[PDB]
Write a protein that binds this DNA or RNA. Structure first.
Ligand SMILES: [Mg+2]
Ligand SMILES: [Mg+2]
Ligand SMILES: [Mg+2]
Ligand SMILES: [Mg+2]
Length: 754
DNA sequence: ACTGTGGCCGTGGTC
DNA sequence: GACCACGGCCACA
């Protein structure tokens, strides 16, 4: 199994290293014969000699074209003759590529900015993370001594914690009597102890959380201060800082630094991304947070240091658990993209798509088109630009959707930049409305690879059902799901402004075909099957037979699938997603349906909005049940009049009136002072410490004037000298919760209260 | 350019 | 009345 590749330099020449793990053994393969290159397209094939003589300067040396060779690659669908230019060293290219491009006889240059070690992976057809190899993993965290006004890492590192399958431990230079704590003399001997542990365990993977920006940079600054060779690399090197945009990232040679933060940040969407919040979201169990000022106070007074020891241990432990949870998916992703786990764990699929396409382009000898320049990226920028669902309560609803609508469209009509308006074909498909014509004589680049992807995904869903190993099944699943994402990302790439295979005509052709096939499918189910489509968005629809039992709907639906799938061209295929006993649809992307087993599902309808109070969420839930499990609209509206009256009589437990709002920043950085902010500023003066991330649990008291002036914290609430604002919780919590739901039923806000 | 972007919204509060 | 800061949805894996 290939972990990664880099290169070093021996006497000015590049030496590819290939870090590998085979049969549980770590190996470094050296390749001293791989040559950097890029392509050039010339006005006349005779001007090659003058191009060979183009020189530049890097450092105190002359940059020369080592050698050239004439090759034939596909470009815009047809074979072309281009000159493959070779050089001595990777770093030669950025110094001479502009001189070759500025040459008059050179029309353009291609594939000139490919990182040398990633180029090696593609040309040699190597795939990271492929094989059986069980990777050894170890996670680690640090706890430091902060003081406001100090430079970064000016204070020492207090504790270092690690965690693996053998447990979680902490190393520190103050005596803490706990069985998972090892005590050393100094911060120096602590960092040295950590280095020994890592060398001893020899992990393939080091897992951090924000290690790219905090942990390694702190360990670095302390190691330079204390003169420690922080030789975490398997080749004796120190961790290496790479800059990815304004972002910083850290690699450890021979291992994989898996920083969880960039992976979590694009897989789940949370208000803030603390380790504790992420562990909560992923595993449901809580994690206590000890703050910088608390850790500093504890270290200085020696009090409650065991609490900081447990927090350090927990940081490591949950980071190892998060690592075991999220690495296999990312490993499958890198195997699919054909790039390193280090790389794919730090980039969005919209950008990983180009690496996948670029590998496909090499596999099929297709000259990759260049990324756009500034003027071109300007012309590609275009401004952002469906019938409202049917009102009422609907019963016996089925949802039918298209299997990979946009990918199937690309494959069925051979949509691709290299097929758009290709002259001299005998068969074209014409896109509705936008009129673009795509050749059908030869398969296109994008459709051909999208076909292999969709076919692969189908094979893997079959092998999934024929696998008893739950580990193997889970990895197959990850692969199948990522394929679906990658195919859609390939469609999206065709519309991306910075995309190499950009093609606006291809993209708007695909949406045009999508609208045509969707409206067609709806017209067929209503006209020839008596269905009524209730709701539709892009690639699926809800529908039922008006006035029909459940079985008649389900059976007649499966018949429509046989009918429409036969009528549909090519890879266009409709499928059956689910049945729903009842459901109502408010507006686009806002609806509620109930599964026969009772499980209710909702689209953006607010149900966990923490912005809201328990009294409002409760009423919303009860209204949904009376609407979907009971079908009584009047029972729902009765519930609303019951709760609004119970609030007005001060008969609702104040505990259900607490509004939990998160403070996002420092109070000094708040321009508009809202109700939770006004409580936070009031608490800060009384002596409390508020900080970015604190939660304010407040209640609104009865009064005129600003809401913030009547808001007190709930632990400050006394039911005998405080009266809550019943009108506020009626008109601005419960009624706004249920108004949009019951406006689709013709009930106006004035019909829901007292 | 996922300690960022894009789209839709709403509300508390100056001025 | 007019406008803004600041949050909540849905995407971006
Ligand atoms: Mg290029
Ligand atoms: Mg720690
Ligand atoms: Mg760092
Ligand atoms: Mg190539």
């Amino acid at each position: 199994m290939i972990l990664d590749t880099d290169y070093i330099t021996e006497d000015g020449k590049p030496v590819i290293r290939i870090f590998k793990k085979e049969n549980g053994e770590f190996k470094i393969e050296y390749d001293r014969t791989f040559e950097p290159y890029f392509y050039a397209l010339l006005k006349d094939d005779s001007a090659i000699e003058e191009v060979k003589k183009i020189t530049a300067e890097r450092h105190g040396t002359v940059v020369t074209v080592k050698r050239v060779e004439k090759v034939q690659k596909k470009f815009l669908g047809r074979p072309v003759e281009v000159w493959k230019l070779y050089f001595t060293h990777p770093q030669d290219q950025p110094a001479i590529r502009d001189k070759i491009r500025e040459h008059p006889a050179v029309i353009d240059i291609y594939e000139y900015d490919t990182p040398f070690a990633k180029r090696y992976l593609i040309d040699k057809g190597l795939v990271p993370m492929e094989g059986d190899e069980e990777l050894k993993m170890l996670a680690f965290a640090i706890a430091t001594l902060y003081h406001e006004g100090e430079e970064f890492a000016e204070g020492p590192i207090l504790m270092i914690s690690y965690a693996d399958e053998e447990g979680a431990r902490v190393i520190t230079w103050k005596n803490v009597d706990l069985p998972y704590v090892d005590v050393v003399s100094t911060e120096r001997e602590m960092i040295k102890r950590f280095l020994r542990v890592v060398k001893e365990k020899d992990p393939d993977v080091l897992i951090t959380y924000n290690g790219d920006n905090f942990d390694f940079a702190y360990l670095k600054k302390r190691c330079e201060k204390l003169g420690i060779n922080f030789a975490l690399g398997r080749d004796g090197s120190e961790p290496k800082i790479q800059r990815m945009g304004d972002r910083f990232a850290v690699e450890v040679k021979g291992r994989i630094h898996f920083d969880l933060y960039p992976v979590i940040r694009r897989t789940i969407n949370l208000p803030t991304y603390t380790l504790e919040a992420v562990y909560e979201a992923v595993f449901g169990q809580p994690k206590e947070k000890v703050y910088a000022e608390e850790i500093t106070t504890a270290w200085e007074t020696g009090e409650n240091l065991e609490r900081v020891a447990r927090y350090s241990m927990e940081d490591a432990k949950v980071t190892y658990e998060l690592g075991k949870e999220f690495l296999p998916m990312e490993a499958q992703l890198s195997r699919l993209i054909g790039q390193s786990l280090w790389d794919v764990s730090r980039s969005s699929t919209g950008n990983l798509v180009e690496w996948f396409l670029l590998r496909k382009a090499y596999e099929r000898n297709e000259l990759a088109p260049n990324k756009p320049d500034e003027k071109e990226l300007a012309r590609r920028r275009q401004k952002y630009e469906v019938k409202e669902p049917e009102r009422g309560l609907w019963e016996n609803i089925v949802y039918l959707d298209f299997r990979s609508l946009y990918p199937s469209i690309i494959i069925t009509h051979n949509v691709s930049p290299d097929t758009l308006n290709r002259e001299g074909c005998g068969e074209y498909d014409v896109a509705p409305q936008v009129g673009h014509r795509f050749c059908k004589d030869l398969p296109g680049f994008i459709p051909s690879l999208l076909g292999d992807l969709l076919e692969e995904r189908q094979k893997i869903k079959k092998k999934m059902k024929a696998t008893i190993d739950p580990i193997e099944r889970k990895l197959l699943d990850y692969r199948q799901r990522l394929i679906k994402i990658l195919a859609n990302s390939v469609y999206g790439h065709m519309g991306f402004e910075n995309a190499r295979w950009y093609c606006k005509e291809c993209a708007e052709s695909v949406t045009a075909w999508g609208r045509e096939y969707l409206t067609m499918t709806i017209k067929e189910i209503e006209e020839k099957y008596g269905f009524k489509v209730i709701y539709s968005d892009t690639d699926g629809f809800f529908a039922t037979i008006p006035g029909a039992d459940a079985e008649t709907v389900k059976k007649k639906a499966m018949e429509f699938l046989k009918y429409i799938n036969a009528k549909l061209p090519g890879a266009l295929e409709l499928e059956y997603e689910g049945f729903y006993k009842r459901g109502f649809f408010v507006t686009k992307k806002k609806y509620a349906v109930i599964d026969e087993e009772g499980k209710i599902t909702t689209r953006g309808l607010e149900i966990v909005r923490r912005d809201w109070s328990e009294i409002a969420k409760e009423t919303q839930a009860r209204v949904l049940e009376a609407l979907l499990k009971d079908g009584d609209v009047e029972k729902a509206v009765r519930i609303v009049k019951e709760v609004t009256e119970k609030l007005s009589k001060y008969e609702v437990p104040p505990e259900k009136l607490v509004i939990h709002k998160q403070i996002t920043r420092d109070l000094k950085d708040y321009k508009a002072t809202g109700p939770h902010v006004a409580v936070a500023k009031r608490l800060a003066a009384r002596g409390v410490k508020i900080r970015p991330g604190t939660v304010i649990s407040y209640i609104v008291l009865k009064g005129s004037g600003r809401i913030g002036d009547r808001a007190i914290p709930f632990d400050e609430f006394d039911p005998t000298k405080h009266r809550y604002d019943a009108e506020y919780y009626i008109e601005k919590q419960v009624l706004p919760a249920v108004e949009r739901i019951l406006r689709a039923f013709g009930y106006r806000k004035e019909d829901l209260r007292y």
